[PDB]
Specification:
SGC - Diamond I04-1 fragment screening, PH-interacting protein, Histone Acetyltransferase, Chain A, binds 2-[methyl(pyridin-2-yl)amino]ethan-1-ol, PanDDA, 5 helices, XChemExplorer, mainly alpha, protein binding
């Protein structure tokens, strides 16, 4: 029932994601010199360094907000991909599966802790 535990749990999960080779295309904002049309398709860029910085700044109130930004990294890759077989998109799907597998208990524990706080 620790309402604050999610933050360190998210820091640890981001550390695992950064050490994963599949995260390399997503560690920093998409390079607009490499992909000149990126902002014509994607309205809201997102990357894991921005998520980590937002967390460290104390600018996430809940793990749901962090999860919405991580999911935006993956939906941006899906929207930008020219093919469902592209290398970077394929990396995003594996990384998404890994993230969802680990974030589920973080979300459950936080929501349970908040319900206990308001019992
Ligand atoms: C650079 N990225 C992330 C786009 O958000 C790509 C590139 C090709 C296919 C899919 N995602």
């Amino acid at each position: 029932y620790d309402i604050q535990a999610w933050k360190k749990q998210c820091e640890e999960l981001l550390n695992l994601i950064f050490q994963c080779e599949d995260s390399e295309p997503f560690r920093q904002p998409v390079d607009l010199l490499e992909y000149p049309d990126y902002r014509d398709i994607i309205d809201t860029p997102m990357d894991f360094a921005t998520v980590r910085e937002t967390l460290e700044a104390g600018n996430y109130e809940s793990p749901m907000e962090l999860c919405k930004d991580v999911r935006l990294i993956f939906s941006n890759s899906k929207a930008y991909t020219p093919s469902k077989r592209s290398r970077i998109y394929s990396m995003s799907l594996r990384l998404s599966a890994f993230f969802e597998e680990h974030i589920s208990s973080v979300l459950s524990d936080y929501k349970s802790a908040l319900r206990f706080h308001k019992r």
